[PDB]
């Protein structure tokens, strides 16, 4: 997400304590890892939650060239909503820790914190969330907790003028709000490079506006 953003202050670092090669139920000890292979690292965990890009650069131009890995695009959106509270409020700190651990281990989980101190958990579906809760109560926290009634995240919208005033009345804003074409909506939902004959994804906006506008004119009139 930092990368999304793209010298001193920029770089945190962790030494690599060990490298092992996965073998299901055992890990084979490794002195060194080489390009191509996938390995288990000890101690690089703290820097990142979910995805991260690891580089070592000895070069100022080399550093400038270097491009950070894009955030992994998970196939589904969580949607399912659980509200948590611990059984006994005094044990909150343990719950908090555990929730962070769950975020690290389960890439599809979102933990949000409400005003109330309630924890909103999003997961993909029933079974998914059930497994989270089991591990949470058993493997990580040792705390019995209250769980709510399964809900869902809602989204806001409309279907069809403005007047507005600054707190120090010098500015005045009028903005129209409009229903969008289902085609357009679908095109936006589909993450794409605009390859083949495919309607260009708006995140390609950094390309010339003429091109962007060409797509809009071409596909929508």
């Amino acid at each position: 997400s930092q990368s999304e953003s793209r010298e001193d202050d920029e770089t945190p670092s962790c030494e690599v304590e060990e490298i092992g090669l996965l073998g299901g139920r055992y890990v084979y000890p490794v002195h060194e890892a080489h390009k191509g292979q996938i390995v288990l690292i000890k101690g690089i965990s703290s820097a990142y939650i979910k995805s991260a890009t690891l580089y070592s650069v000895k070069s100022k131009e080399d550093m400038k060239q270097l491009k950070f890995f894009k955030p992994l695009d998970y196939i589904t959106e969580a949607v399912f909503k659980i509200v948590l509270q611990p059984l006994l409020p005094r044990e909150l700190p343990k719950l908090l820790d555990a929730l962070n651990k769950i975020s690290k281990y389960y890439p599809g989980v979102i933990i949000k914190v409400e005003e109330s101190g309630e924890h909103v958990i999003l997961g993909n579906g029933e079974l998914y969330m059930d497994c989270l809760l089991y591990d949470l109560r058993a493997s990580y926290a040792k705390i019995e907790i209250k769980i709510s009634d399964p809900l869902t995240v809602f989204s806001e919208s409309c279907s069809n003028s403005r007047l507005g005033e600054e707190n120090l009345p010098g500015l005045s804003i009028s903005v129209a709000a409009e229903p969008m074409d289902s085609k357009m909506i679908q095109d936006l939902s589909r993450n794409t490079l605009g390859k083949g004959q495919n309607c260009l994804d708006i995140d390609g906006i950094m390309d010339n506006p003429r091109k962007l506008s060409k797509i809009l004119r071409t596909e929508y009139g």
């Binding site: 006994l88 409020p89 909150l92 101190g117």
Partner: protein, 48 residues
């Protein structure tokens, strides 16, 4: 309203937020509770 029957006291209090928010806040300042633990040790009437 106030009464006392031997030991036990009964007091009725009427607040408005103006007066209400004050009394809440002063207690909070002098007994800060970040974990929301006020309601651990609070006694309901079991009966109802």
């Amino acid at each position: 309203l106030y009464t006392r029957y031997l030991d036990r006291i009964y007091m009725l209090f009427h607040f408005e937020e103006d007066e209400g928010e004050e009394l809440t806040d002063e207690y909070l300042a002098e007994n800060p509770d970040p974990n929301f633990e006020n309601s651990i040790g609070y006694n309901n009437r079991k009966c109802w």
